[PDB]
């Protein structure tokens, strides 16, 4: 269910790497989730905190990981904000337009974080945001 998605032994290894008193902080749990190839947002983090507080047992941590699976994510879902700014419907946005979107709203990235991500995808100024989305989903 979650094991379909991620490596079972890495789940335990990353837990042991970060646990303290047999518990793991939400920040370390989200770090681990990312290493396992999952994508938590602040919504997932607020949700697990409301259930259990800031420090998760191993079992609560596994629950948190299932919450982070997000098997509904796909390109259609991801591009919506970008497409909305693509007034002329070209399929492209400039790096500046994309950096502004990523750093201004939502779980905003720092300027550097956005720059690194956009540069990692392409050396060109005009970005195919659908392909950019396919790439981050990997």
């Amino acid at each position: 269910q979650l094991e379909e998605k991620v490596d079972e032994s890495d789940v335990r290894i990353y837990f042991n790497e970060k646990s303290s008193g047999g518990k793991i902080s939400i920040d370390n749990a989200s770090y681990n989730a990312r290493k396992l190839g999952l994508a938590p947002s602040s919504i997932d983090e607020k949700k697990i905190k409301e259930l259990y507080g800031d420090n998760l047992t191993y079992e609560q941590y596994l629950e948190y990981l299932s919450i982070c699976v997000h098997d509904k994510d796909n390109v259609e879902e991801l591009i919506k904000m970008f497409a909305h700014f693509d007034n002329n419907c070209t399929g492209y946005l400039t790096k500046s337009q994309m950096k502004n979107i990523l750093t201004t709203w939502g779980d905003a990235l720092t300027d550097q974080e956005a720059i690194d991500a956009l540069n990692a995808f392409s050396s060109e100024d005009n970005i195919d945001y659908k392909l950019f989305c396919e790439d981050i989903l990997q």
Partner: peptide, 17 residues
């Protein structure tokens, strides 16, 4: 739009790690 943006930012943070 905003919820979709969070999923974008989430996958970007995943790639950083």
């Amino acid at each position: 739009n905003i919820x979709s943006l969070l999923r974008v930012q989430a996958h970007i943070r995943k790639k950083m790690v």
